[PDB]
Design a protein around this ligand. Sequence first.
Ligand SMILES: CC(=O)SCCNC(=O)CCNC(=O)[C@H](O)C(C)(C)COP(=O)(O)OP(=O)(O)OC[C@H]1O[C@@H](n2cnc3c(N)ncnc32)[C@H](O)[C@@H]1OP(=O)(O)O
Ligand SMILES: CC(=O)SCCNC(=O)CCNC(=O)[C@H](O)C(C)(C)COP(=O)(O)OP(=O)(O)OC[C@H]1O[C@@H](n2cnc3c(N)ncnc32)[C@H](O)[C@@H]1OP(=O)(O)O
Ligand SMILES: CC(=O)SCCNC(=O)CCNC(=O)[C@H](O)C(C)(C)COP(=O)(O)OP(=O)(O)OC[C@H]1O[C@@H](n2cnc3c(N)ncnc32)[C@H](O)[C@@H]1OP(=O)(O)O
Ligand SMILES: CC(=O)SCCNC(=O)CCNC(=O)[C@H](O)C(C)(C)COP(=O)(O)OP(=O)(O)OC[C@H]1O[C@@H](n2cnc3c(N)ncnc32)[C@H](O)[C@@H]1OP(=O)(O)O
Ligand SMILES: NC(=O)c1ccc[n+]([C@@H]2O[C@H](COP(=O)([O-])OP(=O)(O)OC[C@H]3O[C@@H](n4cnc5c(N)ncnc54)[C@H](OP(=O)(O)O)[C@@H]3O)[C@@H](O)[C@H]2O)c1
Ligand SMILES: NC(=O)c1ccc[n+]([C@@H]2O[C@H](COP(=O)([O-])OP(=O)(O)OC[C@H]3O[C@@H](n4cnc5c(N)ncnc54)[C@H](OP(=O)(O)O)[C@@H]3O)[C@@H](O)[C@H]2O)c1
Lengths: 753, 752
Amino acid sequence: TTNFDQEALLYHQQGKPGKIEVISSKPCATEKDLSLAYSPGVAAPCKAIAKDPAKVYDYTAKGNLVAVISNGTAVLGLGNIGPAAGKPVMEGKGILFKQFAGIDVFDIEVAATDVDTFCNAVRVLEPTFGGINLEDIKAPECFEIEERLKKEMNIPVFHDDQHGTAIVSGAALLNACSITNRKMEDMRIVVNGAGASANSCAKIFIALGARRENIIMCDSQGVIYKGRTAGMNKYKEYFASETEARTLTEALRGADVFVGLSVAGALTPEMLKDMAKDPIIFAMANPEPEITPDKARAARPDAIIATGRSDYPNQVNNVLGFPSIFRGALDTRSTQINEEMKLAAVHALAKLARMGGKSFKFGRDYLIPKPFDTRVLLWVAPEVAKAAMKSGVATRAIEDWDQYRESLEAQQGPSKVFIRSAINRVHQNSEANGGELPRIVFPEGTSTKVLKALATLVEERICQPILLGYPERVKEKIKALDIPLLNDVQIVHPSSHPKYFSFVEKLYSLRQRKGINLGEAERLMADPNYFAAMMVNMGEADGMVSGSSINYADAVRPILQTIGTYKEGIPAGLNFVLLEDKFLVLADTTVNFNPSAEQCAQIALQAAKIVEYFGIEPRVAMLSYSNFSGAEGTPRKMKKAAEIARTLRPDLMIEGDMQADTAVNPEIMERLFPFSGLKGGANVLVFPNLESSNIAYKLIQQIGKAEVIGPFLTGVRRSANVLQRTTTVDGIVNSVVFTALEAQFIKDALKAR
Amino acid sequence: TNFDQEALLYHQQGKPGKIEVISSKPCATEKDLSLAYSPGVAAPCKAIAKDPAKVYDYTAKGNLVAVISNGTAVLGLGNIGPAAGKPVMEGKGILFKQFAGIDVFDIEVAATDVDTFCNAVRVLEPTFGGINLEDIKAPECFEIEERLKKEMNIPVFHDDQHGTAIVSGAALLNACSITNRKMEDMRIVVNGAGASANSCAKIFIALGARRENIIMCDSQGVIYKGRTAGMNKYKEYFASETEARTLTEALRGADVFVGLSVAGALTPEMLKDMAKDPIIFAMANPEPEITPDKARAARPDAIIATGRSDYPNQVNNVLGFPSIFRGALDTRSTQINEEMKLAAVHALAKLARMGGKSFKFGRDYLIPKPFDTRVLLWVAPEVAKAAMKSGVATRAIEDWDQYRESLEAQQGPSKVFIRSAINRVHQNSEANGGELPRIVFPEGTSTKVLKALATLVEERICQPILLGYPERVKEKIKALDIPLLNDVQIVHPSSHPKYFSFVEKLYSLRQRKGINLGEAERLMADPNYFAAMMVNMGEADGMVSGSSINYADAVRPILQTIGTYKEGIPAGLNFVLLEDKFLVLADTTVNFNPSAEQCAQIALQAAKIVEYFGIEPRVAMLSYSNFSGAEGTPRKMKKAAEIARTLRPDLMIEGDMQADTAVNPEIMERLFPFSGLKGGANVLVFPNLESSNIAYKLIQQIGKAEVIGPFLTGVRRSANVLQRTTTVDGIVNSVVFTALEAQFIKDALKAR
Ligand SMILES: CC(=O)SCCNC(=O)CCNC(=O)[C@H](O)C(C)(C)COP(=O)(O)OP(=O)(O)OC[C@H]1O[C@@H](n2cnc3c(N)ncnc32)[C@H](O)[C@@H]1OP(=O)(O)O
Ligand SMILES: CC(=O)SCCNC(=O)CCNC(=O)[C@H](O)C(C)(C)COP(=O)(O)OP(=O)(O)OC[C@H]1O[C@@H](n2cnc3c(N)ncnc32)[C@H](O)[C@@H]1OP(=O)(O)O
Ligand SMILES: CC(=O)SCCNC(=O)CCNC(=O)[C@H](O)C(C)(C)COP(=O)(O)OP(=O)(O)OC[C@H]1O[C@@H](n2cnc3c(N)ncnc32)[C@H](O)[C@@H]1OP(=O)(O)O
Ligand SMILES: CC(=O)SCCNC(=O)CCNC(=O)[C@H](O)C(C)(C)COP(=O)(O)OP(=O)(O)OC[C@H]1O[C@@H](n2cnc3c(N)ncnc32)[C@H](O)[C@@H]1OP(=O)(O)O
Ligand SMILES: NC(=O)c1ccc[n+]([C@@H]2O[C@H](COP(=O)([O-])OP(=O)(O)OC[C@H]3O[C@@H](n4cnc5c(N)ncnc54)[C@H](OP(=O)(O)O)[C@@H]3O)[C@@H](O)[C@H]2O)c1
Ligand SMILES: NC(=O)c1ccc[n+]([C@@H]2O[C@H](COP(=O)([O-])OP(=O)(O)OC[C@H]3O[C@@H](n4cnc5c(N)ncnc54)[C@H](OP(=O)(O)O)[C@@H]3O)[C@@H](O)[C@H]2O)c1
């Protein structure tokens, strides 16, 4: 097993067994609350439901809970493994459910291998569950089970295989047809394979506007022809086309859309020559796609390529369809899931792809929205609800949409989507630039944490790393760590680069009158930190990430000495604390020992600019130990800093001084100090000295369940970032992601000048 | 209906459910998605293919029970349907999680028929690691229990019958063993041997009783031979030899009276006719069967242990199912065995028989209070012993020390710290003749203070001496509609009989510090100064203030009047109660910029409090550098750590560190293995006021941990100052700990 395999194995091993747990929604520790929960004060909701049964949806979590039910017979690529071993997949499905829609998930791995036991056992769980997701059931049992369940149950039932990927496939097909200006009246599709996904795709395409005679079904044995005596399954013979294309090679003559859903290797360049004008190719059977996009473009440049892998664009992911469907169904309190909801979802996905703080560009490489696009939910969950306003079988029938919009936004706070949006923005910036990752120089080439994070960063295509150090030693360390992904990395020895002496001359010219001459300049450039700073300054790299193996002072001194600050800029750290519904920005945590009022105001302005880059209105607060006291010492300095920042940036909302609770709690400020101009809480917090900010952010990172990312060195001319020496692998990954974002922004700003 | 509306908020409150499901493992990134979803999620699956039992090592099956039901008998109500019973099942689940740390699902089976219910629960076997099916109808409960025990391996447990049996046996064994009678030969009569009483009688006969040695008289008369009224196939398991039918003749009141059903049937004439030492268990209906006062008045020589929460000797299921099911789960036990039931009842009896002290085992402490922390820590290991002895646990058994460590970790400070503080307050009050500490509140006309005082006086913690106008505060109390405050003591500072003596003593204290008789008379009108003088002169045990005014103006009179003891420095002490440990931040209120000696003294004081709370203190002098010793704060922190080490050479106090290095053992061991601090630091000493204040306030607000404080340490007497931005529950916690400190200081002053 590789390093990733071992990490995945230990993912469910370390700490508490499993991944999911059940906790009280609100705190319950007091004896009065315990009596409210144990003494017969909890019988009152039962009596309330007694007079109104359906009202239970508002009297419990049933309306916000989804079953995830499987028998362990179609677990990914494992085939039949039994319900016992199908538990971690259900846990992962529930994790994805909560991540992408915010719905509580109950994973039930029922041991009903027989169809009758499944049907007569699932039906009895109806009154206590708000919706069921069937999955991981092998054919042909799954089709019959779902068909019986849909009629025999009065609450929505969804199958991730019978109505799963086919929604994203239909959205991609709609976008491809719009690109090719071809209507659904005369379209040719050959759905290779005879699995659940193939039949689901065929059914939804037929219900979408395709003609059943035009479409054909192909499998391992061959194309189902008229009067076929092989494959006596009812579902297989249902999608039987009267033709003579049993041969695989000749079955694709004049094929408008490949939509291939068979194992890898079923497509060849000679086979690719058999497609019709402007064909569309779909991958299948991860992790090996049906055909590589590069060879498809080389052989047939007029074609359109869609894949099921993260590496190549146009990723068909099953996570785009189910979470929004279920969120819309439950919030609208729908009593069933019909084809109208799925068609509405397909239309919404196609519309979103056709048309944080930015988006992609419509084209041949963007037919469906990326799975990391949060707006997906906001653009398809209401639409399903819209279908619930027309199709029917839905109670409640919410009359508002903005309230629904903000309710949906409440379930996608920064703690869930901030890093995902940052990585998506990095990908958008790289792809819009031609497809080159920013060059990030790592002075610590022989650092275990840096290399272990570089494996993930290279796999995720975030940055192009340039490790500094002796090539032999870093290669030995990579081989010892067993990372078969950094073997092709670029390693640059400091005193071997062709531009090394140019860097020495540049540093000598910069600081000739600051205590450095040629003899000292060469020795300084021998250091990896100074060489990395010079590389970043001179344009040989976009950014740099150092300080993992040394203290912050001697890791940030070369950056300030070489790269320096820009006009009217002060170097300053900056941390993002990603809470449930907001992210706070603490500044500064790393550089300034005891900033004055002017320095505090400048730090506040820099932090506000960084916040505004992310599309969030900044509200600065000058933290202190006193609430608008203005007394001698820190309160006076914070008051003066707030006034200076207000004069510099009048349109903002700055106020000081105040304590942390007054700043970050709008209710406290409104109740106690209604005169202050800061309304709604503060997302930017400027600290009086270094000890306060450093200790506060480290304590929040350690003992607080919230996640902090940083510190990021702001106020420097180029994109230089220093990691805290106590960082972890994930901290390095996040910091490198945001360093790549900053480097791309700085490079784009430089170019557009 | 706000009590129901509280759960309706729990059902809306930006959260539409009483319970919710979160992810213990992180899920925020594409790598995390690959780890949790396909194709990475296939990697553990192939691991489980070799051995199915490895699910207990991979998935959350081990810590997963369910409250299965059908709504046939839900709480104090008859048949209601599976749909309408969900809130009570969710309450059972949250009780499970709170008192045992067990994740629990809420499944309702919409089937009154036995066959479908049994089929569904049997087929849910690999889904769940344990079954706590509860609130099903009877006597079909016996049938479903037997069928499920015979069908699948995982332990099926009916909470009602067996938990009632365990609690009844625990209350009965100690009572019988102290009444000069035996539970095996002396003819006990009891009341009931059916449904839950059937399990009660089975537990009794397993604990010494029998069918022939013990004559059983039922709640529904008697289930002996003859009369066939209200008979079923599962009732004659305890036929007796008494041949009478009427309660007067069938029941002669021989040894005990354990009623579990039917309305109140206990007459004073019958209690007089009872032979000797009436042991009465009158849980029965949701409503009390017979009130304990009437039964006690009927027989003065009677020892009555009712089964209601309104009276002492409480009987509850929280001493039953949680600990025993935790024990069964931890060993991956197969099915449910009687031996574990007798082990649990013996553990409860021993715990009942054997902070500062505990309530005397007499007529009031037959069983401990049904929320005590030691209950689980005692019952669960014994249930594990029984499960191992019965040979039903497939999983191997390790040393019991690690098991006890895990059981203790199941209930960290965040769940039990305030409750244990309240219990210690009550124990100190009981050990002091029932007197409560007198706490004087300078702000007698503060809405938050009065609202918190309602709960504080309802919980019997402190005695308010609210200062201010005797009429204005009464008007405020009437406006806020708090009845319990109608009997509190209101003192006008300028009209108290001891006002002039206090003025004279204040003038004597600070005659050479800018205060003369006129200025002392002017200052004693201040409620803060008067409360401080009251505490200093012993007329009140403690005081809390600052809920409306800023900290400086609220703490200056305390420092000027009460002062600091020898070798003491005033400091603010905050407790951050995390899931596994509690940190102590100091100082957060007073010292603008303490020096090395001041920081060392603050650390010593904080270590003293931590030692008082029964935890080994580990001190860390926080800074922005990691053992750098550079000019400025790092050098001051290093010097302070050295001074504190020389002062108390038995604690582990380590240099200057960042917060992450201090509170994380892994970072400390990996980066700085040359240090003397091991296992993390539970005491943090900050270099200045801004750092500590901002850190504690930010942790309180944006963190998910509970911060209680700040507490004023280093003063001669008990006197705390609340934060201006405090809430009602914060005031409640601060007053609880102020009362605890006042009791400790009064006890210290009583001697010498
Ligand atoms: C995540 C963590 O680990 S946080 C740890 C806490 N932080 C620390 O321990 C480090 C705190 N900072 C410091 O100790 C220092 O201020 C350092 C390391 C930034 C600089 O060391 P110093 O001896 O003060 O300065 P140094 O000689 O390196 O100065 C380098 C350059 O920075 C510039 N500089 C430093 N601070 C500032 C500032 N606030 N504004 C503008 N320029 C500045 C100087 O002008 C100088 O430029 P020059 O070469 O043209 O003269
Ligand atoms: C994306 C995130 O997460 S952070 C988002 C932050 N949002 C913002 O709006 C950031 C605000 N702006 C900034 O931080 C910066 O000032 C930026 C991004 C505008 C970049 O400013 P820069 O382009 O680096 O300024 P710079 O001073 O280098 O450019 C002016 C010229 O002076 C030159 N120059 C100035 N000082 C020096 C020096 N010491 N040595 C050499 N050249 C110098 C530069 O080479 C440049 O010349 P060029 O354009 O021919 O190459
Ligand atoms: C929870 C929150 O909101 S925390 C808010 C942040 N904290 C604050 O704003 C308050 C910080 N503390 C202070 O400002 C001051 O130190 C105060 C208010 C406590 C008192 O300091 P001063 O106002 O200078 O005191 P003052 O001159 O009135 O004397 C008061 C007494 O306190 C004593 N005292 C004050 N600080 C100390 C100390 N660190 N050690 C010993 N004694 C002390 C003085 O000796 C004096 O006693 P004395 O009259 O017998 O000589
Ligand atoms: C419980 C928690 O959570 S925190 C745990 C840790 N807490 C602590 O350590 C708090 C410490 N608080 C205390 O009171 C200390 O334990 C003590 C008892 C040692 C302090 O002693 P003090 O309160 O200073 O009193 P002291 O020992 O001086 O009293 C002896 C005599 O001096 C007299 N006295 C002392 N100071 C004065 C004064 N200013 N004016 C008049 N008489 C005085 C007392 O009247 C007493 O006389 P008596 O024998 O006739 O009764
Ligand atoms: N969007 C996605 O990335 C996505 C979504 C869902 C599922 N999946 C993948 O789908 C798989 C599970 O579902 P499935 O229905 O695809 O399983 P599957 O039915 O086993 O997939 C292959 C089947 O297609 C037929 N087939 C056609 N041409 C074939 C050929 N040349 N070689 C072999 N078989 C050929 C065979 O069926 P006959 O023997 O009956 O002819 C074969 O059993 C997993 O790999 C899962 O990851 C991917
Ligand atoms: N130890 C505990 O914490 C504990 C235990 C149990 C109950 N309670 C409390 O008691 C309430 C629940 O009541 P419950 O009925 O489930 O438990 P219960 O009153 O202790 O059980 C008595 C059972 O006997 C039967 N019975 C026979 N005659 C009866 C009569 N006249 N009235 C009532 N029942 C009669 C009923 O079963 P049939 O309907 O099958 O005859 C009933 O379920 C809740 O408030 C709950 O909190 C607490």
